[PDB]
Design an enzyme around this catalytic site. Structure first.
Site, mmCIF file in Angstrom:
data_model
loop_
_atom_site.group_PDB
_atom_site.id
_atom_site.type_symbol
_atom_site.label_atom_id
_atom_site.label_comp_id
_atom_site.label_asym_id
_atom_site.label_seq_id
_atom_site.Cartn_x
_atom_site.Cartn_y
_atom_site.Cartn_z
ATOM 1 N N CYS A 88 11.257 4.797 2.744
ATOM 2 C CA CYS A 88 10.716 3.449 2.974
ATOM 3 C C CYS A 88 11.762 2.395 3.133
ATOM 4 C CB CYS A 88 9.779 2.966 1.857
ATOM 5 S SG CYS A 88 8.784 4.300 1.159
ATOM 6 N N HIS A 347 2.443 0.359 7.312
ATOM 7 C CA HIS A 347 3.688 0.850 6.722
ATOM 8 C C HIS A 347 4.270 1.957 7.607
ATOM 9 C CE1 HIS A 347 6.680 1.185 3.624
ATOM 10 N NE2 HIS A 347 6.300 2.385 3.216
ATOM 11 N N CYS A 377 10.165 -0.710 -2.329
ATOM 12 C CA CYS A 377 10.162 0.507 -3.136
ATOM 13 C C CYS A 377 10.266 1.734 -2.216
ATOM 14 C CB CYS A 377 8.915 0.580 -4.003
ATOM 15 S SG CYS A 377 7.424 0.900 -3.091
ATOM 16 N N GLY A 379 10.219 6.043 -1.901
ATOM 17 C CA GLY A 379 9.799 7.365 -2.350
ATOM 18 C C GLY A 379 10.966 8.138 -2.918
#
Ligand code: OPI
Ligand code: OPI
Ligand code: NA
Lengths: 391, 390, 392, 391
Positions: A88, A347, A377, A379
């Site tokens: 991300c 996203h 944030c 993964g």
């Protein structure tokens, strides 16, 4: 001390899963945003030293999709190009890595960002040894390489459930956030606030070309009522849903980087100066918490207090994690994701970080905001942040 | 700022579907990360970030560099990421880590690459569904690894494009290919890969196995066996299986930190990174890449080609490698002195890290002061780095 | 008058081991060889065939109507017809009965019937028309799904075998003894030459060279009871059915050339036997191994025969459990049953197996001068098929 | 001499490719048809001895789908069931095979016909030996096993071209024939002439159930222009097009058979007596010609002249072949496919013979036609035909 600016920026519109960019390769979106940043700064593609693109799901797209986006955008063969993956956070990290190329005197002019086509991500199977007997799985690389925790085996929305449970966040607080995000985004959309940053992308067809310039994932007229109807998506007794989590999406976003002195030579009015960035690790079980230490670390590097910030882009993977971050950091919610966030917009993993950075930069220009921060944030349990100051 | 490689390790390179046939990239990676830290006497918890080149991560799960980092005992507090400049990634990773330290964003980096070409899956985009007719399941190793995106031909056609431009005979490439194998078997039996190699235990229900020898190297490589090959990429060509590198699995990495830090830690470093560069060239003739990238590296290092004591020049193909030697005009006796990738193998994403390991461990062994490492890259690029011994 | 149909000639391929001799040989190639053989052995030209009828359970990816492909390859004229059918394990024997029917009703005079299978060439598949918009999906082994898994309970045929083991209280030792005895009888028959007559050799063409296959490759030589006893149960952890006391996955084809008894006599053919009766009956899918019991009884009734009238029996060995259950219920002298061994040893090429065990029955009746025989098989999804044959 | 009657018959509506029955397994359509013939005859599932269903594309559907259809329909476990394949001919051939079971005294009551889901047919690859390196093909089982000639490697449409060329059939003649088919089938459908044959099929769904009881492939208001506009599909200077060929379709159809005596005992007024049947081979290159010798042989076996026929259902694989058949046989075109044919209704391969049989039987009853014939051509060069007389 170096001082490196974002001369210009651009992103495609964010597409819905198997929507407008159902069949559009990541590097195609990539190429459009590379020419856009070049056209927007008044710099020739022939002046780009390197292109750096965050991408998580490149399987079957061929050798080094970053070079394919570069070459298609008319960056000369003499330049270089590469892709990276910090999930991300990739599209924002690529911007920091680009800054580093310039800060270390390795390059004068960089295009960095991210690209992602979650639509075009293939199914796969390791098949060399051959399957002498029995069924075998065709694995969804989007799910496997994008959304599944590699250590616990469960999906990212299960990590959101962990964060929700830690911070004791009610379904109603997560849903109120969700509808807030949609409402903010549909306002921005109608109010024209995404037009600056979005570059139209043309979807070529036999039947006819289709120009895409609006974010198609934003739900018009999202109500709390609609939110409260949904079932929990990851825990039968959980609070996380499709309504209060982001979606599966396709897009690209980039920024043109160079030294402050260079922009000034060229008459460029940059969108910002990169004052700091930081990446930090945390427990993958609660990866949603990433932005808490990363933002604090970025602010420490920037020499700033949290109150100094006029504008924040804190990526909305899930309402649970998003509320938690806002809770912890204590920044005025009114300055966070003012044009909506990922729950509404989508996203597109490898591009997300460059996407929200775009949104931050253009709204800073729009309001005349001085100091700003982007954070996501990540993964596996990480966070990345970056501090931007207006020139 | 002055950044040194504190330590370095690599797995042996496995032959295609051979020793590591069912070994994830990130497990080979985890072994190399631990080995760098152990060799340096550095706690894993001291590691800021792990940066791994990898070209073929499909099916392997989120961010395999972080999976390696975690499997190697680097705490959850560190960060990790993967990157792809194809064959350059393993060396580019080390440049990238040096930059992390140069800009003051990190104290200690583990950088390198990892690849399992055997574990690369077949794939097809299937969401829209195939309403009727046959379709192709795509070998991601070939598509995403060795097939040029622009012309749609393999990397062996580029090498032929270079063979025809530099007018390199099939004899010359077999002279090169046998010469490479000889050096590699000499070096191997002579015990010169021992230091750099960290053994890897392949776990099994039949028994564990310990891999600590490069298995793609051919023992007793004769010109005949080369001259008995048919061309692989053109019916009238000079490129073959024998004068080209292989498909391979492996990992390699370096521990980076400032020079000052290496001295606080009382570590005797393998070398100081003096410069590096990456450059673009016509994709059609990608193997030429090492020329501009090694010249820039050298100009950036304030060195002459006459200064180098040792060079590692990745032999993707014999034609591209001969041509680089020809143009750069360095002493071929100091170039790939323990053999090259034709002999050793080319685990795409690890390869730059691989050839750095070899370069660094041999500079120590013979006491060379300056070394240059360099690779050509699919799509037409070159990476290079200049390493001075302390 | 009541029609009388004879089997004028028969042939089979050697049965191949899974991914063994015939690993890459399409079923219709085996079939073509066998069709050529029955014609040759009967002295009947391919030009005289009216129809070819071939059982085949796993035709996926082989192309249009592999029976017709077999027939055309064999030189059967385009004016003849051919078709495939599927009654699972029963297919190869049912084909023979369907052939008989064509003649009995006056629609054909000369038929080649039997079955063919390449389990090795069975592909994996997936329905991909509507796309897989997200999430993993299975590539299904057609061999397992279409050949060996029950469609109603979702479990493999070996679980049905466990079910029969349990109902009949058949010990692991009993099943293992049966399986070793199958191996040892088949080895003995093989070494003595007793499969030569039935087997037509098959040439596996290559580039590296051609290889002639004329031995059943699945038969284990010198099979030990210890070898069976050591195996783990394959379908139930506390079960008795193992890879050793079950048949295998195999390739092969087998066929018979049919015609009226009057037509054989015109031609001067000494037939392998007269078809006196057949039957097919259903049973519970959960104990499909029991099919032979009602099928046999009905076949015998229709023939006007007592169990004791039989001189030889081929009762197919899908699994030792069901084999033993069938023999226990029917009460026929085990010494007359599968005298040359059975499927545990020889193999189980699904759509071919009924014709395979017919082959074995016919050539043994001939060898030993047995007057009355019966061939029977159990069938996935709960059925049985049986046929009665008398020497002429 | 044995005399076998068709007591009752039923078919599903024929679905469009990836249409109404896109995700309905063939055996589910077959079960509904089995239940229907039993209902229509007044015969209980307990009385059925054997079910015989033609099916060309069973891959992935599981063990012996015929049995699966029989069991779902409540046919007892003591009955038996099996599948067969003589390609296009299979549904009709099944009926003849049923007839034979009764005639030889092996059964009393048979349900025979066919079923096909071309939609559900998978793609496949032989993978046991492994594929050590390089791409490989996933084969469409529908095209491979259903529609490609095994000898020449070309699709059935190329056979139809061969017949076009040999019989000197213009593109205009073929288009006219195809328009006429569509317009006859639309008329029949609007007038309710398919109601009696069709049994409605309920397609179960979470979002609700859908009852399907109309043939969805029939084009309403089909224009000659629409046909003329099409490009030849199989040869660039060809005449065969998607418009003058049948389609890819899903459906099932069946007939319940018994002896004429048995029907009389039960008080059943049967749909027709099976007077004769035949199957013959021809050159696979011109497989569309199969009906010619098959029909002549059936008529010979019945002792009937072509002139004796009151109604004909001659399957329309392609306009080209349907026209050649009609030209050769010389039967009055006004009695052939009076409610339209496959070009409009569709071609669910293994069911198609039973489908056209259904249409024949219901029209013979409707108009009081004494003597009928049903015939189809068959891939690989065969024909099958059946003569039916009213009782
Ligand atoms: C049932 C199956 C084939 C999926 C399986 O469990 O593994 C098969 C093995 C490994 C037990 C193998 O020894 C085998 O082929 N067993 C026999 C399978 C089988 O049902 N054969 C046909 C018997 O009618
Ligand atoms: C024949 C095939 C399927 C390979 C092909 O050409 O592509 C399909 C289309 C879309 C072009 C279209 O012509 C079509 O539906 N063809 C199927 C024609 C066919 O074989 N019909 C069966 C006639 O009985
Ligand atoms: Na259904």
């Amino acid at each position: 001390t170096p001082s490196i600016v974002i001369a210009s920026a651009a992103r495609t519109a964010v597409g819905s899963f198997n929507g407008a960019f159902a069949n559009t390769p990541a590097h195609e979106l990539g190429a459009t945003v590379i020419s856009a940043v070049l056209e927007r700064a008044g710099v020739a593609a022939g002046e780009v030293n390197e292109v750096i693109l965050g991408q998580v799901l490149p399987a079957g797209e061929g050798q080094n999709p970053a070079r394919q986006a570069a070459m298609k955008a008319g960056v000369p063969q003499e330049a270089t190009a590469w892709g990276m993956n910090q999930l991300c956070g990739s599209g924002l990290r690529a911007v920091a890595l680009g800054m580093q190329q310039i800060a270390t005197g390795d390059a004068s002019i960089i295009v960095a960002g991210g690209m992602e086509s979650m639509s075009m991500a293939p199914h796969c199977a390791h098949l060399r040894g051959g399957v002498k007997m029995g069924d075998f799985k065709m694995i969804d690389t989007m799910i496997k390489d994008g959304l599944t925790d590699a250590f616990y085996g469960y999906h990212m929305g299960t990590t959101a459930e962990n964060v929700a449970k830690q911070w004791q966040l009610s379904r109603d607080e997560q849903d109120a956030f969700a509808v807030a995000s949609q409402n903010k985004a549909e306002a921005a959309q109608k109010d024209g606030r995404f037009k600056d940053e979005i570059v139209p992308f043309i979807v070529k067809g036999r039947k006819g070309d289709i120009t895409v310039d609006a974010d198609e994932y934003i739900r018009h007229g999202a109500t709390l009522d609609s939110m409260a109807k949904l079932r929990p998506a990851f825990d039968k007794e959980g609070t996380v849903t499709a309504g209060n989590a982001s979606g599966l999406n396709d897009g690209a976003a980039a920024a043109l980087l160079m030294s402050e002195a260079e922009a000034s030579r060229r008459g460029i009015q940059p969108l910002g100066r990169i004052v700091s960035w930081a990446t930090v690790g945390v427990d993958p079980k609660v990866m949603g918490t990433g932005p808490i230490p990363a933002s604090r670390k970025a602010l420490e590097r920037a020499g700033w207090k949290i109150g100094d910030l006029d504008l924040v882009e804190a990526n909305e993977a899930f309402a649970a994690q998003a509320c938690a971050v806002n809770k912890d950091l204590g920044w005025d919610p009114s300055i966070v994701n003012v044009n909506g966030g990922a729950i509404a917009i989508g996203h597109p993993i490898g591009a997300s970080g460059a996407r929200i950075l775009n949104t931050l930069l253009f709204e800073m220009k729009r309001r005349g905001a001085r100091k700003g921060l982007a954070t996501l944030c990540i993964g596996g349990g990480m966070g990345v942040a970056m501090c931007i100051e207006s020139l």
